Design a binder for this molecule. Sequence first.
Ligand SMILES: Cc1cc(OCC(N)=O)c2cccc(C)c2n1
Lengths: 39, 156
Amino acid sequence: DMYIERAGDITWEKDAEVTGNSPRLDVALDESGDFSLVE
Amino acid sequence: GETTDGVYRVMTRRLLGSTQVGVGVMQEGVFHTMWHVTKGAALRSGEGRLDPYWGDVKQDLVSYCGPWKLDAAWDGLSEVQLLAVPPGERAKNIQTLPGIFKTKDGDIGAVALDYPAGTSGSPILDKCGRVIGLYGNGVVIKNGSYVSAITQGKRE
Ligand SMILES: Cc1cc(OCC(N)=O)c2cccc(C)c2n1
């Protein structure tokens, strides 16, 4: 049995840590809702 | 229960200890998360019970107590923030520029941030603060790193 616990507000925090890249990928979506890399 | 707008952890005791299986958004009385987090199961909040109202395995989405409420979308241009809620660790904004999932049906935002599975369901925000979808369904790339779609539902 699962339960929820409040973790914070939904706010944009100015001068948040900025990182990660921006890749363009070709992907398939199956009937199970799994993404997979089309190459 | 707690019906207050904001972000939540999704916990189970069914394993060892209290294990965080995911994250979700409460908005307008409705809880939004990813199907693979709950598998459609009901949720406890105080004594309060939360029962599923809508879901789709293929979108990998599920709402509790009412229809899907989050309609805002990534504009294709601006930076966003992952409001990342990892297990045992405090909610924390990461700013990032989304890449693209290119699919035979269309193009979706992709956020390339690497975080545990229990983070699945953390919300993605535009500059106005609105949720433009949820982090935690996607793909492992050449590097061994993880990239998530921006997953958004429809609002009737
Ligand atoms: C947040 C998240 C979610 C995942 O799988 C769940 C899904 N459906 O995408 C992951 C799978 C492998 C590795 C990592 C780092 C993952 N991170």
